[PDB]
Amino acid sequence: GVGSSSGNWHCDSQWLGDRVITTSTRTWALPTYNNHLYKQISNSTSGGSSNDNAYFGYSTPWGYFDFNRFHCHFSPRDWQRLINNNWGFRPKRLNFKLFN
Amino acid sequence: GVGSSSGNWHCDSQWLGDRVITTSTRTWALPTYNNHLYKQISNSTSGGSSNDNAYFGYSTPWGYFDFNRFHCHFSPRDWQRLINNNWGFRPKRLNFKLFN
Amino acid sequence: GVGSSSGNWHCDSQWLGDRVITTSTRTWALPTYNNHLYKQISNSTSGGSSNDNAYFGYSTPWGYFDFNRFHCHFSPRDWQRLINNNWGFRPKRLNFKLFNIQVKEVTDNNGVKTIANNLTSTVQVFTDSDYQLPYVLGSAHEGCLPPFPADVFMIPQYGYLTLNDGSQAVGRSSFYCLEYFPSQMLRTGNNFQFSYEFENVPFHSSYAHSQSLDRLMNPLIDQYLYYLSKTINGSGQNQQTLKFSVAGPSNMAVQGRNYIPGPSYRQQRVSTTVTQNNNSEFAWPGASSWALNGRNSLMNPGPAMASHKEGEDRFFPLSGSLIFGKQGTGRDNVDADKVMITNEEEIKTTNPVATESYGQVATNHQSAKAQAQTGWVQNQGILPGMVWQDRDVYLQGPIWAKIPHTDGNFHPSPLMGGFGMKHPPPQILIKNTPVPADPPTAFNKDKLNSFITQYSTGQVSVEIEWELQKENSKRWNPEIQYTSNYYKSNNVEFAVNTEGVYSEPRPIGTRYLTRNL
């Protein structure tokens, strides 16, 4: 419905023995890209360059979600906990939500 | 028996969730004190002093075991673990052995 | 009890189909090390040195048990059986026993030494089963069980190194107290034992190849591939052409192949005929080395490479092979007849020669002007499609090594030979418990400095079960076998002399049987 929220703000960390679960929530804005068009791009369209910098490709009207950085998930204090107390870590599970 | 050991050397620390168990083993030597006698002692026997330093008491032929210091139980690294990761601690249980 | 033995003498070998079980018992003596103290050591305490030799570490009052050599378990005859009849072997199980402990006290008057029993003293023993201590086994050190079962041996002292900056330490350096481990305490009458299962490791290759990597083709049939054979029609100007020929039995060097020899790291060549060597000092300056944090280390023995070409057995790589000492050989500047130089000639069929370039590569573009130019490859890393053999093991050599705990490694077979394991047989540490002399009759807070002089002796047993890999060759002609020579001599090889000294006259490898590629 229009007048009902689709989700809550979830942002904390839980340290559970040999596991740690991080949760992050952020506010995003998405514009219209490319005037809804697909465009061919190249160093020709960028103005030319040397051979080492030539390319050919496409830009799309879509955007994308990226969280491939550690500070997207760990606060500085949580990072301190992790690195001061552990020989190792690795990711196991992921859950992703898009709402409101 | 004469040819059988009465105990083993136990010295480590176990960190178990919200508990830590420290174990310490040391080698001790005990002499004969006072030539097996009880003696009355005082500042008179010590050579005299001011009023603020006067005393009267007894020395015994016995010795005693003391472990009332934190480094008797915690290695420096264990102390670092404790103080860098906890808001509090307190002692709960004690076990004491004398052997060999 | 005092009057009852804690174990028996077990020393033999059982050959049971595809298994062999070795058992060894020896008599050991353990002194008090360091006056019961931990001491910081460095090249400063050793007297200084160059930058390449600086270190920082600690010596401990503990000793340790090492049996990481093949002659600790195999008699020469058993080794002959193994290597003459098997393509492979590997260790599976281990059992360790320590028993018949005797602790003695020594009193030295003005002119007499008296040794007596101390029935109430203890020895402490423990295994580093969690691999929490620096692993000093796997550095080819002295102090293992002696090859001859009748020899009484002295237990070596434990020490370790940590991070150093010159002779100084950094904040990252670790100090380990071995009393901070739980250990078993033994009076005369107690014994100690434990069992261990080896990791799954590949069989060692106790065979040589009867084929060469460049000779794997049918010598009667052509290939269906062509090779460029001529680029000029003949003498004169403007004679350029392209001619192609079938690669066949007449030109085996240009045939297409699926697999290539393994990697290389070139060594300097030294002749045992000294007059053929250059009249200069090149032991250090001419040696191959690698650098780490500004320190140079010898590349020794380095990657497994063939020692020499055919008919050039007088040449050896400068630091590319294991050199053992003969019985009674000193430690400083001994002659070549006093040492035993091994040679890995059996792997010349897959591995490049240690003292040669790997090959040639193009280094330009030829055109109509520049001619075709090639360059020598002195060190070649791993390439896809490369095959190689590892270094052989010896009756006098090491058995296993601990793979360093790192993010990455490649083919972690130890470079001095043997089996590389992440969880090798654990270190076994032993120490005489200190017994103070008479303390003063007034309290003093300082640690006691006066101790009764003590040492200990006992028996140690190690039993290893090994799995064998038998040969089922279809070769018609007889194989090469390790054998004794009938010709008469003053002594018997692998025996004692008139003075009672046992010696091993030569190194014995494992590669006598043959296999195809």
Measure the N-to-C terminal CA separation of chain A; round to a whole number of Å. 11
- Residues 6 or more apart whose CB falls under 8 angstroms from that of C190 comprise B3, B4, B5, C6, C101, C184
Measure the N-to-C terminal CA separation of chain C; round to a whole number of Å. 60
Cα distance between residue C80 and residue C72, in whole Å: 15
Place of tokens 């990597």: C213
- Residues 6 or more apart whose CB falls under 8 angstroms from that of A2 comprise none
Cα distance between residue C421 and residue C427, in whole Å: 14
Structure tokens at C197: 């299962």
Q: Of C493, C508, C497, C475, which Cα lies nearest the Cα of C211?
A: C475
B87 touches chain A (CB under 8 A): no
Backbone CA torsion sign across C330, C332, C338, C343: positive
C318-325 contact pairs (CB < 8 A, 24+): C318/C267, C318/C268, C318/C269, C318/C270, C318/C283, C318/C286, C318/C287, C318/C288, C319/C267, C319/C287, C319/C288, C320/C267, C320/C354, C320/C355, C321/C354, C322/C394, C322/C397, C322/C416, C322/C417, C322/C507, C324/C394, C324/C396, C324/C507
User: At residue A51, what is the residue type?
Assistant: N
Cα distance between residue C43 and residue C54, in whole Å: 5
For residue B85, the chain A residues in CB contact (below 8 A) are: 85
A85 touches chain B (CB under 8 A): yes
Residues B56, B42 contacting (CB under 8 angstroms): yes
Residue C476 marked as a ligand binder: no
Nearest CA in chain C to B99: C185
Resolution in A: 2.3
For residue C119, the chain B residues in CB contact (below 8 A) are: 2-3
Residues constituting chain B: 100
Cα distance between residue C77 and residue C149, in whole Å: 14
Q: Residue B24, exposed/middle/buried by CB under 10 A (0-12, 13-18, 19+)?
A: middle
Three-point CA angle C374, C380, C381, nearest 5°: 145
- Residues 6 or more apart whose CB falls under 8 angstroms from that of C338 comprise C325, C326, C329, C330
Nearest CA in chain B to A16: B17
Residue A76: asked if its preceding bond is cis (omega within 30°), the reply is no
- Residues 6 or more apart whose CB falls under 8 angstroms from that of C216 comprise C257, C517
Core vs surface per residue B25-53: b (16+ CB within 10 A) or e: beeeeeeebeeeeeeeeeeeeeeeeeeee
Structure tokens at B12: 């480590």
Q: Of C402, C384, C212, C216, which Cα lies nearest the Cα of C310?
A: C212
Core vs surface per residue C184-222: b (16+ CB within 10 A) or e: bbbbbbbbbebebebeebeebbbbbbeeebeeebeeeee
Cα distance between residue C182 and residue B8, in whole Å: 8
- Residues 6 or more apart whose CB falls under 8 angstroms from that of C351 comprise C261, C262, C304, C305, C306, C344, C388, C389
CB atoms within 10 A of CB C32: 19
Q: How was this structure determined?
A: cryo-EM
User: What is the enclosing helix (H) or strand (E) of C77?
Assistant: helix C76-85
Residues C426, C96 contacting (CB under 8 angstroms): no
Which subunits have 3 or more CB–CB pairs within 8 Å of chain B?
Answer: A, C
Nearest to C182 among B4, B9, B29 (CB): B9
Structure tokens at C29: 């003596």
Cα distance between residue C51 and residue C459, in whole Å: 43
DSSP assignments along C185-235, one per residue: EE-BTB-EEEEEEPPP-PPEE--EESS-TT--S-TTS--S-EEEEEEESSS
Cα distance between residue C302 and residue C267, in whole Å: 9
Q: Of C438, C437, C442, C435, which Cα lies nearest the Cα of B35?
A: C442
DSSP assignments along C312-346, one per residue: -TTEEESSSS-EEEPTT--SSS--GGGEEE---GG
State the SS3 of chain B.
CCCCCCCCECCEEEEECCEEEEECCCCCCCCCCHHHCCEEEEHHHHCCCCHHHCCEEEECCCCCCCCCCHHHCCCHHHHHHHHHHCCCCCCCCCCCCCCC
Say whether C460 sits in a helix, a strand or coil. Answer: strand
Residues C396, C69 contacting (CB under 8 angstroms): yes
Q: In chain B, how long is the greatest CA-to-CA distance?
A: 56
- Residues 6 or more apart whose CB falls under 8 angstroms from that of C512 comprise C83, C84, C206, C207, C208, C479, C480, C481, C482
Distance from B89 to chain C by nearest Cα, in Å? 23
Structure tokens at C13: 């070998």
Backbone CA torsion sign across C10, C13, C14, C17: positive
User: What is the enclosing helix (H) or strand (E) of C182?
Assistant: none
Residues C93, C16 contacting (CB under 8 angstroms): no
Q: How far is CA C490 from the centre of its chain?
A: 32
B14 touches chain C (CB under 8 A): no
User: Left, alpha or beta for B34 (phi > 0: left; psi -120 to 50: alpha)?
Assistant: left
A11-15 contact pairs (CB < 8 A, 24+): A13/A74, A13/A75, A13/A78, A15/A81
Residue C251 marked as a ligand binder: yes
Q: How far is CA C162 from the centre of its chain?
A: 22
B18 touches chain A (CB under 8 A): no
Measure the N-to-C terminal CA separation of chain B; round to a whole number of Å. 11
Residues facing B12 on adjacent strands: B23
